[PDB]
């Protein structure tokens, strides 16, 4: 039992906020690297790698969203158990 998440969606999908900046963190960091040597192609390479895992992140938090889906299968299938 819940209250809806639009009463609560600046928390409920804040939680992003921070695990994406654990991705932001770590490619500001590359970018640590890339505003000391910049175009430097094995820092600046791993600066538009974690770029792109910084999207990977964003796409995780599209995975996750249907993962909690498949504990809630598992739920589905407590009530199934209930036998």
Avoid at 35 to 45: E, G, H, I, T, Y
Avoid at 76 to 82: A, G, I, R, V, W
Wanted: glycine share 2%; net charge negative; hydrophobic share 35%.
């Amino acid at each position: 039992m819940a209250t809806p998440w639009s009463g609560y969606l600046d928390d409920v999908s804040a939680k992003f906020d921070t695990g994406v900046d654990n991705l932001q963190t770590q490619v500001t960091e590359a970018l640590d690297k890339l505003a000391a040597k910049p175009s430097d192609p094995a820092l600046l390479a791993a600066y538009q790698s974690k770029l792109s895992e910084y999207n990977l992140y964003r796409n995780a938090q599209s995975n996750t969203v249907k993962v909690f889906k498949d504990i809630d299968a598992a739920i589905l299938e407590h009530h199934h158990h209930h036998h």
